[PDB]
């Protein structure tokens, strides 16, 4: 936000979060035609202005129009700033968020790969912000039913989350679970069970010290009995996974464990 547009911003910000669409839009519209004569159209502050009103149309559910503004901001940003510049990836992302809210997922997908390619160059292939861009771009492929890609990007995100960050890490457990869902969505049940196990082995290794032969994880006590907020879901998922297999003496165990742990 520039110093110049910074005092008008706070007011529109205020006159939007008060449901005064009749006040806010003209304040933007007229402040844009003002700056349009000042520093030309292809100036970055028009692009910044076209992004603040675009966020006004998004704020009061007029997505058709919101994106019409963010493509214009993107055209300016592409011009002066650059084809592979960070602020152009930023507006290639905000524009993709709008396509998803309108249901145009097939149409947000090419924007999100470009927002990623800019991130891959800027931050480096293995940066954790690349892992969140991947965890996003996979959700988009899921909303398209492109399972094979959903699997790919989550695994790519997991590679960064697991390697760059720690083991107990929330994203490590969350991305495992998301990939574990994807595997089931495609009938890769051993792959899914494997993941649901890993999360728990670590979860038990976190609060019970370490994995022994006499102090094993829940799933191991459950598979033998048959003869983290993200963990309540793992327990519920894996539990019901044993249900498919017929392992009911093992399904009830985690289902009992899940209802207790809250």
Numbering used by the authors: 194 to 420, 445 to 479
What does the article say, verbatim?
In order to analyse the structural impact of LFP-motif binding on the TPR domain of KLC, especially at the TPR1 motif, we crystallized an unbound complete TPR domain of KLC2 and compared it to the previously solved KLC2-TPR bound to LFP-motif. Interestingly, the three KLC2-TPR[A1-B6] molecules make the same crystal packing contact with a 2-fold axis symmetrical counterpart leading to TPR1:TPR1’ interactions. In the KLC2-TPR[A1-B6] structure (this study) which is the unique unbound form, the A1 helix exhibits a “IN” orientation, while in the three ligand-bound forms, the A1 helix exhibits one or the other orientation. Finally, because of the crystal packing contacts at the TPR1 motif, we cannot elucidate what component of the crystal packing contacts or the binding of the LFP-motif triggers the A1 helix reorientation observed in KLC2-TPR[A1-B6] (this study) structure.
Kinesin1 functions as a hetero-tetramer composed of a dimer of kinesin heavy chains (KHC) bound to two kinesin light chains (KLC). KLC is also composed of three regions: a N-terminal Heptad Repeat (HR) region that binds to the KHC stalk, a TPR (Tetratrico Peptide Repeat) domain involved in cargo recruitment, and a variable C-terminal region.
